[PDB]
Structures are given as C-alpha cells and as structure tokens.
C-alpha cells in the first residue's frame, strides 16, 4: 500500500502519521499489531476520501 | 349600563396622569388616560396584524403569521414586510400591555382597593417582555422573538425547545412547570372547596368557613385557611410566570449547550465514587 509512494513522499507521510497517531515508531516493525492496523487504516482513510 | 350597586362607586378621581378629561365610562369599561393609549395601541397592533395578514396572502386565523426579522438584521429596524411590522406590533403590544396594567391601577385607585392585580399582571407582562425584547437584546437580534401567529408561535416554542436538546431537563423549566401544575391543582381544590360549602346536597344547610376549613384538615391534615389560599395562590401563579421568564432568559444567553448536559454538575461531583 506504501511501496509505490516515492521516497520523499513516503518519508513525509510516515513522519506525519507517527505524529498524527502519537506512535513514534509506527510501521517500524511489520510484525507489530500497530503496523497491521495502520496499513488497514491507510486503506480505510483512502476509502473515506473517495467513496464517501 | 350599570349594576344594581355600581352607581355609588362611580366617583371622579383616582387617576394617575389623566384628570376629568378622560375620567368617564364607555359602557361597562372605564376609560382613562391609559385607557386612551390602550385603545390606540391595541387597535393599531390589531390592524397591523391584519394588514400583515393581507400582505402574507392569507386571512386564516390559524395561518396568519407575522414573524420577526432575520438574525442578520441584528437589533436594528427591519423592512416592514421583512420583519419590521413585527417590531412595530411588539412596540404596540408593549404599550397596550403597560397601559392596560396602568389602567388597572386607575381602576383600583378609584375603588379604594389594593394594587395586587396590576402587580400580578405586570409579572405576566414581564414574562412577555422577557420573551420579545429582553431575550433578543441578550442575543443581539430581534429575530429571536416568537412570531405573532396562532400556530406559528407554537412552532417557535417547539424549535426553541429542541434548540436546547430536550428542554425538559431545563432546571428553571422544571421549576416553572411544577408551579403551573400546582396552581391548577390549587385552583381546582380551592374552587371545589367554596362551591361544595356553598352548594351542599339538597335539603342541607350551607356550610360556613369552619366546615370548609376542617374538610382539608380531615382530608390532607392541614388547611391553609380562607385568607391563606388566596395569597399562596397568587404567589404560586406569580412564581409560575416569573420562573417561566427565567427558563427562557437563561436558555440562549446563559446556557448555549444542551440542557441535560447542564446536569453534569450533579453527575460529576468529587463525592460520587466514580
């Protein structure tokens, strides 16, 4: 879901999401349940913006 | 005409600002200086209502609706067909009501009786005054007054009532309503007491104050007396009018949020073991 993003945009988005959710190490470890939910939350956020 | 005893009481004097110029009766009504202004203001307000009804397009008494201006107009005067007519009728209504109360002062001054009735009416005037000129000023717009319609002003009460999220939880409305119910309860019991004492079953002597005094002593264990009921009843009704003024004057300019959320002070106290 984030692989196609450019390096500058991925760093920009990752830094914001960590500050937006208050998790400093968000998406650092894929095994962590924080990363599992965040990936789905990213897809949810995109769904709300375009489908709703 | 005159009652069988009205001739003696019809004496000149007891006028506030008027003199013998307006000191006369028209039929049963007593005209005074404030009866002159009452007649002018009431007729002007009534005619303007029907003039607005003509321009509104309907003369149906249920559907007649003279409404205050938009909130965008603020406290300034609005165009006559855009809310300005409502402001003038309000000015006429205030003049008609105040003059009516002041005329009642002239009535009771001429009769040598107390000024309780004009004072009691002034409380009801204050309830109207706080609804049409006091609350709008505290909000900065004349558009918050109720429209002058038989059913339109019911929509305003409905919308204003739900504008504060279940108005039933308004503490002053809670106090005001229980005064309204108690006054009707007191009116029913007091009216029943006198009628029952004066109208016994056929073939029975009429009952004096002692018989009616002891009835509630045997009924509810305490009787407030012939004199007590009238003063407590007047205060019950005046409190109902006064607390009605409070419940609407604290709605917007005091508690803009929902009324159940006002009760959060009771739900959230340090004493309660959360």
């Amino acid at each position: 879901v984030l692989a196609d993003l450019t390096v500058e945009n991925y760093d920009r988005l990752l830094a914001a999401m960590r500050s937006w959710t208050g998790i400093p190490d968000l998406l650092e470890d894929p095994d962590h349940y924080q990363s599992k939910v965040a990936i789905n939350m990213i897809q949810m956020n995109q769904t709300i913006n375009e489908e709703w | 005409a005159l009652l069988s005893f009205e001739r003696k009481y019809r004496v000149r004097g007891g006028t506030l600002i008027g003199g013998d110029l307006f000191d006369f009766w028209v039929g049963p009504f007593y005209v005074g200086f404030f009866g002159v202004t009452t007649a002018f203001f009431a007729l002007l307000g009534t005619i303007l209502i029907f003039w607005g009804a003509s321009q509104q397009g309907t003369f149906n008494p249920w559907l007649i609706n003279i409404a205050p201006p938009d909130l965008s107009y603020g406290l300034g005067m609005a165009p006559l067909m855009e809310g300005g007519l409502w402001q003038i009728i309000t000015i006429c209504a205030i003049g008609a009501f105040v003059s009516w109360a002041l005329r009642e002062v002239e009535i009771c001054r001429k009769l040598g009786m107390g000024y309780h009735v004009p004072f009691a009416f002034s409380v009801a005037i204050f309830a109207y005054v706080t609804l049409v000129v006091f609350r709008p000023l505290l909000m900065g717009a004349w558009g918050h007054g109720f429209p002058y319609g038989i059913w339109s002003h019911l929509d305003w009460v409905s919308n204003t009532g739900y504008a504060y999220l279940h108005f039933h939880y308004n503490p002053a409305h809670m106090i005001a309503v229980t005064f309204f119910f108690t006054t009707t309860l007191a009116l029913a019991l007091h009216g029943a007491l006198v009628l029952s004492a004066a109208n016994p079953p056929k073939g029975e002597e009429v009952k004096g104050p002692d018989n009616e005094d002891t009835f509630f002593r045997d009924f509810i264990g305490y009787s407030i007396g012939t004199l007590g009921i009238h003063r407590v009843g007047l205060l019950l009704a005046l409190n109902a009018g006064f607390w009605s003024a409070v419940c609407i004057i604290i709605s917007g300019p005091v508690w803009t949020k929902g009324w159940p959320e006002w009760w959060n002070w009771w739900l959230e106290m340090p004493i309660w073991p959360s």
Binding site: - | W262, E268, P270
Partner: protein, 52 residues
C-alpha cells in the same frame, strides 16, 4: 422574626462563602452552589431553631 431573619442571613452568607470556598479548591460554580444552597437550608434552619 428578627432573630429568624438574621439567622437566615447568616446561612445565606455561609452559603455564599461555601459556594466560593469549594470553587477555590476546585469543583465548579454549579457544584459549589448546590453545597452552598444545601448549607443555607441546613445551618440556616438549625440556627433559626436553636438560637431563636
């Protein structure tokens, strides 16, 4: 009256003091007012009965 009116006046002064006394240590105006109103009923009635 006189004594009873004065005793009631002491209660309402105490009720006002308790209204602002609890506001200082926290609470809120409405929460403090209820204690102040409650204090006025209790000590005002007790003083009007015992002192007078």
């Amino acid at each position: 009256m006189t004594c009873t009116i004065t005793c009631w006046g002491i209660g309402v002064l105490l009720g006002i003091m308790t209204t602002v006394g609890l506001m200082v240590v926290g609470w809120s105006f409405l929460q403090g007012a209820f204690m102040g109103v409650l204090a006025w009923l209790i000590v005002g009635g007790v003083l009007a009965v015992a002192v007078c």
